[PDB]
């Protein structure tokens, strides 16, 4: 699993199921894995799930 990497949400994201990670613009998401070209997996707000790469920017 990925360690020490984070992304910041650029927009709010409300998922379609509990497999998807909900967040608000500005939230910092702790990255865990990459699902495919368009989706990442991470944790924020106590939950773990998938979300779109296009909704975040990777932090330095």
């Amino acid at each position: 699993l990925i360690k020490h990497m984070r992304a910041e949400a650029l927009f709010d994201f409300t998922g379609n199921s509990k497999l998807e990670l909900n967040f608000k613009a500005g939230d910092v998401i702790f990255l865990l894995s990459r699902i495919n070209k368009d989706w990442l997996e991470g944790t924020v707000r106590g939950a773990t799930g998938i979300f779109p790469l296009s909704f975040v920017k990777i932090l330095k």
Binding site: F11, F13, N36, D38, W39, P52, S54, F55
Partner: peptide, 13 residues
């Protein structure tokens, strides 16, 4: 700013 479109979800159907 408007939210971008959501990419197709992973699937096997």
């Amino acid at each position: 700013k408007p939210q971008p479109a959501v990419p197709p979800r992973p699937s096997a159907d």
